[PDB]
Amino acid sequence: EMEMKNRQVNHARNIWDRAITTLPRVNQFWYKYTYMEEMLGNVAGARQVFERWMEWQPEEQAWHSYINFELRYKEVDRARTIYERFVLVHPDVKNWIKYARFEEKHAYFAHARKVYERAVEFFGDEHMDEHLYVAFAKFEENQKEFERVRVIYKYALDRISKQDAQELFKNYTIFEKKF
Amino acid sequence: VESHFDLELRAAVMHDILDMMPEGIKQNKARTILQHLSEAWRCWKAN
Amino acid sequence: RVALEKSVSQKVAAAYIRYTPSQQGVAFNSGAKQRVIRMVEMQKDPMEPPRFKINKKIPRGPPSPPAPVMHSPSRKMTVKEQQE
Amino acid sequence: YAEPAHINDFMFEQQRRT
Amino acid sequence: WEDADFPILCQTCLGENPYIRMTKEKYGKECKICARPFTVFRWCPGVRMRFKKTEVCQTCSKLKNVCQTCLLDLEYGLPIQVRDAGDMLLKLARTTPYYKRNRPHICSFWVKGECKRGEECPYRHEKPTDPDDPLADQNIKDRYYGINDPVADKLLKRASTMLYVGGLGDTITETDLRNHFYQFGEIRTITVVQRQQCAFIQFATRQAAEVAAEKSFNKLIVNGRRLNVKWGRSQAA
Amino acid sequence: SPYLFSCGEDKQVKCWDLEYNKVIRHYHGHLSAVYGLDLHPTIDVLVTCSRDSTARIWDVRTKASVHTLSGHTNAVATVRCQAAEPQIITGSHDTTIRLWDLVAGKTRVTLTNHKKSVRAVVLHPRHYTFASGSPDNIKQWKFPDGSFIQNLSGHNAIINTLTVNSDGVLVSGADNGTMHLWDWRTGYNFQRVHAAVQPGSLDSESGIFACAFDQSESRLLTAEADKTIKVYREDDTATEETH
RNA sequence: CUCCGAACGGUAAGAGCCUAGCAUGUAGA
RNA sequence: GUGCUCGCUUCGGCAGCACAUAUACUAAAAUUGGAACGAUACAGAGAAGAUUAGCAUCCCCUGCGCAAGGAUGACGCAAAUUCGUGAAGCG
């Protein structure tokens, strides 16, 4: 902070690179380097520092910040290429439902079909963590009725002992009936 | 003389109280836990 | 075993060459491109006292490679476990 | 830049004398 | 306390012979200026030389940029006082280093009068260069430090006591020479003659060209050449 | 050789021979107490871990300090050696591991693990990529230049000694009396049983500070802090499948 | 009847003046 | 230096060849500058004392020392509430 407060930018970057190489487990120095790069230009050194921070096995809060910084820089191919190794590290239910983020920008039909096939071919063939089916039903209700009645009724092989939830059976029935 | 026994016994408690006790982020000072230990030594000395 | 035997021999005894002059030699003493010289060892006679009894020879510098640990990150356990 | 060598004794000393 | 592999030697201290013969001695003779055990090796610089040895240790000489047995320099050849206080050194130095250092010092039996060894004196039979000048009086520790040299002042005053330029060929051109003179000042009448590969320049009231006379006494090195300079007429002859 | 070696808090490494049952070497030179000692698999040298600032490499039949490996910032709790597995391997109590080279003497490579003080190192009984032991987040290593292979189970207790046999079973002894057994191929908790106390012991005083398997790799022997040596054998059962 | 002992544990404490047996072998111009 | 060339070829010289291959802190050192617990002299362990023990966690000398005995240098650092600032991420 004392080096960034002054007009020296070469020594500040050399101190930040040494702090990032000596303390790889620290996250405050990486956040300060990301803030200094956002205060600076949009050169490829910021993307290289982000790739070096992501290659050091970061958490989901750093991956979400990198995805937000990529989405706030008008990047479509670079955001989709950097999202392939994010789902392969943390296979969470919040990360599997956020992997199909290209449908919310240009509606990405082939990419949504590939993401649905990857979500059906992933882990959870018997329970699906009670979160992929509701998102698939919402994506089918927002789109046309191609496979909206199939995955809600004929795909009950991955259900857990009651074929629905307690407060989400009549709601799913009303969502499938009136759409 | 007897001093190595004392130095060893205090340092081993120091090593153990470094490793365990806090178990996360505590380490309540240092001299304090050794002082409670010393008082305990006097307490067992108290017959 | 060879390294330990050499170290034990040193502890028991304690307790040609071709160099190109590529620094300033260009035209002064012209012809020195390899400087082939012989370096022999002086035969020390085994009837001699020691050179000294104490010395202050600085062997090297204490600056080592202080790299990071990279084991894990630091955090806290709980608010109640801190008071416990 | 110095390095070792395994040079001919006789010819070394001969060229020296010469 | 200090062993090594090869000495940090000079180019003149080694000798005018491409093959010499060294003799390493592990832990000999106790370094002159720091008092530490180091690795003494001597050799013969050439035929009828002085059998030169090694005085100043590896860390002693490596730290202060100096040779292990004359304390002049590995890069230039000047003393350690001139190369500190004083660039000027490049025109002050010399190539072909005189071997008047590697010769035997004076036979004291001859100075007294009876050198019994006759023609077989392995020392040197000249007269002792008179004691009076302080170049009879330098030592090692005052030499090795910058403080108090008898040589370095006498060579440092050589540095401030003391036009037909030629050697053009194909490197020097007219615009490079007049822009190298333009930083000195303005011209009155300049010309370039190619039958002798020379250039003629003048100045308003010399002066600026005077430091060009300080710059070009076999010293102005542009385009990688030692230029030839002698005096013009300035007499309308 | 036909002799045994002993070291302790008396700042002396005694090589008690078996031919006369007396002190045959009585080596000295450590600046403080000694933690452990072990001999090489092929060389006739012994590495001894001290408590002051470093470990010592003592040569047998010479009583001379071969090389001083000072690479830690605290006491060296455990030390392991090998013929070609990892040469010199010393575990330090300064929350860092270091494996030095026996020929050069300097440190070669340091670990990327162990926020808790690591005090358990042991050799592997098959091929390379052996593991270590610490109080929190015990992981595994590799013989060639080190590599984090896998982490252990949830053993948050302060571990003191870890012993593994050639059959693939690994057991870690803690200071709280609970001994947690694991596997080498997978790393699943097999027994994770707790040891009882002796009649003269307290309610919570037993702690496994030493554990070593037999030469036949069939009967296990663990040393507790309750002044009792217990011998554990196998059990001829079949309905003991792991979930 | 023929088995013989050596050292340390011991001489002060200083004031002003006076005299001695030694030791290194150098790079420099 | 020794030997040999059916060397030139006399017994002189010269030639060829073979063999034989690098000593040495070279100086009669040139220089160059220090100290004794000496004697003498004067004087002479001062003509005493309220803390109570102490023991550990940087060197030189004597000594054949892995015996021994001599001489020496620490307090302020603060474990944990309320509020403002910057950044990541969510609806």
Given a contact cutoff of 8 angstroms between Cβ atoms, the answer to whether E51 and E122 are in contact is no
* Resolution to 1 decimal place, in Å: 8.0
User: How far is Cα E25 from Cα F23, in angstroms, rounded to an integer?
Assistant: 43
Check whether residue E62 has its CB closer than 7 Å to nucleic acid strand G. no
Closest-CA distance of chain F to residue B8, Å: 7
CA F66 to C1' H39, whole Å: 57
User: Which one, of A141, A132, A178, lies nearest residue A159 by Cα?
Assistant: A132
User: How far is Cα F134 from Cα F152, in angstroms, rounded to an integer?
Assistant: 10
User: Which one, of F186, F193, F192, F198, lies nearest residue F228 by Cα?
Assistant: F198
> In chain F, which residues have their Cβ closer than 8 Å to the Cβ of C12?
62, 64
Number of domains in chain A: 1
User: Which one, of E177, E185, E190, lies nearest residue E207 by Cα?
Assistant: E185
Chain C interface includes B29 (CB < 8 A): no
Residue for token pair 């060892």: C41
- Domain enclosing residue E224, as ranges: 163-231
> If you count them, how many residues does chain F have?
243
Check whether residue E108 has its CB closer than 7 Å to nucleic acid strand G. no
> If you count them, how many residues does chain D have?
18
User: How far is Cα E126 from Cα E133, in angstroms, rounded to an integer?
Assistant: 18
3-state secondary structure of F38: strand
Axis-axis angle for helices A10-22, A44-54 (nearest 10) = 10
User: How far is Cα A124 from Cα A95, in angstroms, rounded to an integer?
Assistant: 14
User: How far is Cα F149 from Cα B2, in angstroms, rounded to an integer?
Assistant: 46
Structure tokens at E127: 């007269």
> In chain C, which residues have their Cβ closer than 8 Å to the Cβ of B23?
77, 81
CA E19 to C1' H18, whole Å: 29
CB-count exposure of residue E123 (10 Å: 0-12, 13-18, 19+)? middle
Check CB contact under 8 Å for C7 and F96: no
3-state secondary structure of A164: coil
What are the residues whose beta carbons fall under 8 Å from the beta carbon of C66, sequence distance 6 or more?
A: A22
User: Which one, of A132, A66, A69, A76, lies nearest residue A108 by Cα?
Assistant: A76
The pair phi, psi for residue F181, each rounded to 5°, is -95, 145
Structure tokens at E144: 């090795």
Strand H interface, E 37-66, C-beta < 7 A: 44, 48, 51
CA distances from A150 to A72, A153, C80, E121, F117 (A): 37, 6, 49, 116, 56
The pair phi, psi for residue F170, each rounded to 5°, is -125, 135
Check whether residue A169 has its CB closer than 7 Å to nucleic acid strand H. no
> In chain C, which residues have their Cβ closer than 8 Å to the Cβ of E25?
41-42, 44
Beta strands, E only, E29-176: 38-42, 164-166
In the structure, how many helices (H) and strands (E) does chain A have? Answer: 11, 0
Residue for token pair 């789109």: A143
Q: How many CA atoms lie within 13 A of E4 on its CB side?
A: 24
DSSP assignment string, F106-120: SEEEE-S--SSPP-E
User: How far is Cα B21 from Cα F158, in angstroms, rounded to an integer?
Assistant: 10
Structure tokens at E233: 């007429």
Check CB contact under 8 Å for D4 and C18: yes
Q: For chain C, give the secondary structure using H, E and C.
A: CHHHHHHHHHHHHHCCEEECCCCCCCCCCCCCCCCEEEEEECCCCCCCCCCCCCCCCCCCCCCCCCCCCCCCCCCCCCHHHHHC
Out of F67, F112, F114, closest to residue C7 by CB: F67
For position E173, which CATH number holds?
Answer: 3.30.70.330
User: How far is Cα E32 from Cα A125, in angstroms, rounded to an integer?
Assistant: 83
Amino acid at B3: S
Structure tokens at A7: 């007009």
What are the residues whose beta carbons fall under 8 Å from the beta carbon of F136, sequence distance 6 or more?
A: B23, F115, F116, F156
Q: Report residue F238 CA to chain centroid gap.
A: 32
Structure tokens at E170: 């194909």
Beta strands F13-14; E198-200: pairing state: unpaired
Beta strands, E only, F82-227: 88-92, 97-100, 107-110, 120-121, 132-133, 159-164, 169-174, 178-183, 193-194, 210-213, 220-223
Check whether residue E126 has its CB closer than 7 Å to nucleic acid strand G. no
User: How far is Cα E84 from Cα E80, in angstroms, rounded to an integer?
Assistant: 6
Given a contact cutoff of 8 angstroms between Cβ atoms, the answer to whether E38 and E25 are in contact is no
Scored b (16 or more CB within 10 A) or e, E188-211 reads eeeebeeeeebbebebeeeeebee
- Domain enclosing residue A49, as ranges: 1-179
